[PDB]
Amino acid sequence: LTPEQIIAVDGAHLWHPYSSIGRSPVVAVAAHGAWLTLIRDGQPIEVLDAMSSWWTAIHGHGHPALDQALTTQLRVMNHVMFGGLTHEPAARLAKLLVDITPAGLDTVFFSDSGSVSVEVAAKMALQYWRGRGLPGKRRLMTWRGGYHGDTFLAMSICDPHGGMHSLWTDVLAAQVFAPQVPRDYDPAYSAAFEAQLAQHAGELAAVVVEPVVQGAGGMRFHDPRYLHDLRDICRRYEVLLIFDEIATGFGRTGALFAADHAGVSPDIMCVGKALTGGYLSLAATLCTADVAHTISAGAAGALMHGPTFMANPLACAVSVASVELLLGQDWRTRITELAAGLTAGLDTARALPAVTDVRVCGAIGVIECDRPVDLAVATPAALDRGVWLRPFRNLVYAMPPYICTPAEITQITSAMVEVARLVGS
Amino acid sequence: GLTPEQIIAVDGAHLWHPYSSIGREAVSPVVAVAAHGAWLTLIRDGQPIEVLDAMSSWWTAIHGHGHPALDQALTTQLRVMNHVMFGGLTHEPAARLAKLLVDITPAGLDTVFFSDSGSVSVEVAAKMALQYWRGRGLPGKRRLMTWRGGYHGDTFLAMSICDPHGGMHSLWTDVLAAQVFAPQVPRDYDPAYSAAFEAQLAQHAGELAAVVVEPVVQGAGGMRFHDPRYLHDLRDICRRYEVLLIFDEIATGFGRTGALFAADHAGVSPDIMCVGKALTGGYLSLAATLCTADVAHTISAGAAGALMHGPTFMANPLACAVSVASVELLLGQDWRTRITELAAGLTAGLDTARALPAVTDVRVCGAIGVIECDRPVDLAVATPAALDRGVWLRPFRNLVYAMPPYICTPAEITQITSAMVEVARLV
Ligand SMILES: *Cc1c(COP(=O)(O)O)cnc(C)c1O
Ligand SMILES: *Cc1c(COP(=O)(O)O)cnc(C)c1O
Ligand SMILES: NCc1nc2ccccc2s1
């Protein structure tokens, strides 16, 4: 198919994310390193993938180590059913994940998507308390501003009013919501969180939050000390603590996992997105040995979940390579350099008339605007400057590949600033 | 690098397996070290042995493992574009696959929403159904109806329409959505069943967004078959009472039942359809939800607006590329004759099990063969028996069954069925 034919087929037959049908996408034809080749007005152009393809492509596209890991595994074994069989890619990846995640997370359940890994975490929490003979502990608690995926359970802990799933609240499980967690640390907030949790403790299976950075809900940051408070509160009231690190994992916030900013270990943890270096869909839910054993010794005797492509050897093999590539370099210095480049590059946006905030956390850079960003203006403005940016809500933001040179980061931040300037034009 | 012993050690300490425990699995998993064609290489007592993948790795591996055409499609795409976000961008693999799927699926399904697994595609189908009726100003139409014996995945909405026994709905009391269940659809066609289904649906019609069923073959819920004519009845009932019809063809798709899609046995088109498992030829996780023009434009014209779903790895170029190759490989051969031959081989091979003491039924539909026994099948006994005969079988409950790769030779089908018959004999 030509780009023209792709556009025609796409218009007729393809549903895009968070969209309606019939009420235009840009053709992508190649991706290498930090760069995409897109078709604009019939001609190929090279643009920086400032979004890392929705936060996945941390080593960029077509990395030789990841490519070879995939082709090596493809030669041996593409996939076998994980029911009754095991294999080396799953074992290598599970061993890696247990060793690099917060202390105490000793078991690994692979699934094929982030939303599913969140449902698995919830199922773990619910089955845990059923195993303890306390089936009334079945509700979830979170704070506002959150996002945890698009399946119906995950939707139930999305922000009820400003969240993308707000229109569904009347058919979702009704969960417990604390107010928006502030950026700066305020002990009054933690005290109020505890007071609210206290009156629901007997019906709460778990607290579920995104640690440090809330992503799709508004790119909001909060002080890591809140996580210390959450761990304490959950410990004292016997509520499981679940961290959704599907966006924050694998170095993105400047720590390997955002939980590490607070030295906190949850009872259950979800990871995904950057897990495979953006090659293939894979996610994982980890839990402590205590949780696993309590589920396993329960009247159920088994965690009742088992995706068809569970622990897919191809996805596991590229994930192993991606994690090893990350760990085998000085990733912390790399991220610190990125963060410094984002900070320096976005500083001039603070003075722009339409800009209300500029904030950076590791390899996350955000310009918050005073109005929703119009993609019809933003997209060509960024493409004109050789950068693929995808704003949402009132945010112009970047989550660049870790392989971006300082010059490339400067190019990215320059485009972001010019998009923000156009917002107030 | 890891030896098989080190793999077992890591696995026992750190890996969850499907529907299992940590620490008290009666049987340790077996180490798989290679797969090629219809054959797996497994480690038995330290020795690598080649055994037939009689299960097609849970319905997925219809062209066998490491098929050259599929390997090639994957590596070709890998060299140009591994993955880009589907938010704001599109690409040739997505377009090629979408075009293929709309052309070969039942008439009227012309829009495709890609996702990353079967369970998610079922959730997307339910969301479509619910949002559809919201778009018609009937938000009370929010429940689902199905018949017993079904399986539709493991996420919480998918669980709510799984058979209340199979999905152990006593453990999840009040947790799951309360859906409407009709009785187990029988194997043989009985118009009384359909009339009863209709009467039950009628009393719930103002509450119901959709009927969701597996057409012709109910897989994980019990490998049960039913007459295609029931689907004709469902289509009619749904039309007259204004309830959408959703077919979950995640297990039945791409030729498995002897038709390209099981719906084709009845010549009916659902409003929404889910596909998966064999979509990628068993290389990578991919699924899709298709709907009619009416469904898509009613959702899109609703005040609610956009369908708020968007998997991060939606329409992944690698998975789409291999799927295109898998579908073209299927369509480029006389697949109908291939399946008919497989069915003949299964029927011939399983015939002798019918007289076995423990066996209550033997049934075959396309490339699916089932021996139903009168008691649960012991894995600790059945697995070495099968392996001794060069076959990887995975019984569940009282069922010894197989869904072999379409590339299996007559000799391989003879080997598989003989292994099944022997497992039944040992029961
Ligand atoms: C296997 C299956 C599913 C779920 O697919 P996963 O990829 O395991 O989530 C759903 N419906 C049917 C009919 C299936 O056979
Ligand atoms: C991306 C993401 C998920 C899962 O989304 P998918 O669309 O299923 O990949 C869940 N939680 C958070 C915090 C995420 O960023
Ligand atoms: N479901 C995966 C994602 N969903 C979103 C939503 C808004 C911004 C980024 C993302 S990534």
Helices (H), B142-267: 156-159, 191-204, 229-241
Contact list in A for residue B325 (CB cut-off 8 A) is none
Distance CA A239, CA A242 (A): 10
Q: Which amino acid residue places its CA nearest to atom 2 of ligand 3?
A: B312
> Which class for A133: exposed (0-12), middle (13-18), buried (19 or more C-beta within 10 A)?
exposed
> For residue B180, what is the enclosing H or E element?
strand B180-182
Residue A99: how many other CB atoms lie within 10 Å? 11
Contact A15 B111 (CB under 8 A): yes
- If you measure from the C-alpha of residue B104 to the centroid of ligand 2, how many angstroms do you get, rounded to a whole number? 32
Residue A147 in contact with ligand 2 by CB distance below 6 A = yes
Q: Find residues 388-427 of chain B whose CB sits inside 8 Å of chain A.
A: 394
Contact B34, A77 (CB under 8 A): yes
| A404/A409 Cα distance (integer angstroms) | 6
Residues contacting ligand 3 via CB (< 6 Å): A 54, 150, 216, 392; B 310-312
Residues 8-27 of A with CB under 8 A from B: 9-10, 12-23, 25-27
Would you list the DSSP string of A383-410? HTTTEE---BTTEEEE---TT--HHHHH
A117: Cα within 13 Å, side-chain hemisphere: 34
How is residue A121 written in tokens? 């975490």
Q: How far apart are the first and last CA of chain A?
A: 39
Handedness of CA B325, B331, B332, B338 (dihedral sign): positive
- Fill in the amino acid letter for A118: V
Domains (ranges, CATH) in chain A?
1-62+330-425 (3.90.1150.10), 63-329 (3.40.640.10)
DSSP B331-378: HTS-HHHHHHHHHHHHHHHHGGGGGSTTEEEEEE-SS-EEEEESSPPP
Environment class of residue A195 by beta-carbon count within 10 Å: exposed (0-12), middle (13-18) or buried (19+)?
exposed
**Å from CA of A148 to ligand 3 middle:** 10
- Specify the resolution in Å: 1.7
The reply to whether B91 touches chain A by the CB within 8 Å rule is yes
Cβ of A106 under 8 Å from any chain B Cβ?
yes
Does the annotation mark A279 as catalytic? no
Asked if B123's CB is within 8 angstroms of A151's CB, the reply is: yes
Instruction: Write the residue in B22, B33, B96 that is nearest to A107 by C-beta.
Output: B22
Q: What angle do CA A221, A227, A229 make, to 5 degrees?
A: 130
Q: Is A399 in the pocket of ligand 2 (CB under 6 A)?
A: no
Q: Per-residue DSSP letters for A203-240?
A: GEEEEEE-SSEE-TTT-EE--THHHHHHHHHHHHHT-E
With CA atoms as reference, report the closest residue to B305 among A22, A334, A276, A104.
A22
How many angstroms separate the CA atoms of A52 and A34, rounded? 8
Residue reference for tokens 């049908």:
A21
Ligand 1 pocket residue status of B163, Cβ below 6 Å = no
Pick out the residues of the known binding site of A for substrate.
54, 147, 273, 306, 390
Residues at the binding site of B are 58, 118-119, 151, 248, 277, 310-312, 394
Instruction: Extract the annotated binding site of B for pyridoxal 5'-phosphate.
Output: 118-119, 248, 311-312
Whether B306 and chain A come into contact, CB under 8 Å, resolves to yes
- Nearest residue of chain A to residue B121 (CA atoms): A151
Residues of A with Cβ-Cβ distance to B93 under 8 angstroms:
none
**Residues on chain B touching A390 (C-beta within 8 angstroms):** 85, 87-88
Contact assessment for residue B192 and residue B160, using Cβ atoms and an 8 Å cutoff = no
CA B141 to CA B204: how far, in whole Å?
A: 9
Contact B90 A10 (CB under 8 A): yes
Interface residue B83 vs chain A (CB under 8 A): yes
d(CA B255, CA B244): 25
Selecting from B21, B155, B156 the residue whose C-beta is nearest the C-beta of A296 gives B21
A44: nearest Cα among A2, A80, A15: A2
β A395-398/A43-49 pair status: unpaired
| Rounded Cα–Cα distance for residues B283 and B75 (Å) | 12
Could you tell me the two tokens for B269? Answer: 């088109």
Kindly identify the ligand whose nearest atom is closest to the C-alpha of A273: 2
* Buried/exposed code over B170-204 (b: 16+ C-beta within 10 A; e: otherwise): ebbeebbbebbbbebbeeeeeeebbeebbeebeee
**Contact yes or no for B147/B197 (Cβ under 8 A):** yes
Cα B330 to Cα B326: distance, rounded to the nearest angstrom: 6
Point out the annotated binding site of A for pyridoxal 5'-phosphate.
Answer: 114-115, 244, 307-308
Residues A211 and A226: their CA atoms lie apart, in Å, by 9
Residues A376 and B247: their CA atoms lie apart, in Å, by 38
Find the CB nearest A14 among B11, B90, B316.
B90
- For residue A52, give the nearest of A338, A377, A419 by alpha carbon: A338
Q: Determine whether the shortest distance from the Cβ of B117 to ligand 1 is under 6 A.
A: yes
For residue B284 the two structure tokens come to 């990578």
Dihedrals phi, psi of B199, to nearest 5 degrees: -60, -40
- Measured from the Cα of B312, ligand 3's closest atom is 2
Q: What is the dihedral of CA A220, A221, A222, A224, to 10 degrees?
A: 150
Please give the order of strands across the beta sheet that includes B180-182.
B109-115, B287-292, B272-275, B244-248, B208-213, B143-147, B180-182
HSE-up of residue B199 (Cα within 13 Å, Cβ side):
7
- The structure was resolved experimentally with X-ray
Contact call for residues A350 and A359 (beta carbons, < 8 A): no
Burial (CB count within 10 angstroms: exposed 0-12, middle 13-18, buried 19+), residue A199 = exposed
B250 Cβ inside 6 Å of ligand 1: yes
Residue (of A237, A275, A269) closest to A104 by Cα position? A269
- Pair of tokens at residue A162: 């400003």
Mutation test residue for ligand 2: of A111, A116, A273, the one with most atoms within 8 Å of CB: A273
A82 in contact with B at a CB cutoff of 8 Å?
yes
Hey, of B51, B82, B391, which one would you mutate to test binding to chain A, going by the most A CBs within 10 A of its CB?
A: B82
Which residues are within 8 A (CB) of A359 and not within 5 positions of it... i.e. 6 or more apart? Answer: A219, A221, A365, A366, A368
Residues B317 and B93: beta-carbon distance below 8 Å? yes
Cα of A248 vs its chain's centroid, Å = 6
| Chain A CB within 8 Å of residue B68 CB | no
Q: What share of chain A is helix, strand, coil (3-state, %, to 5)?
A: 40, 20, 40
Residue type, B285: S
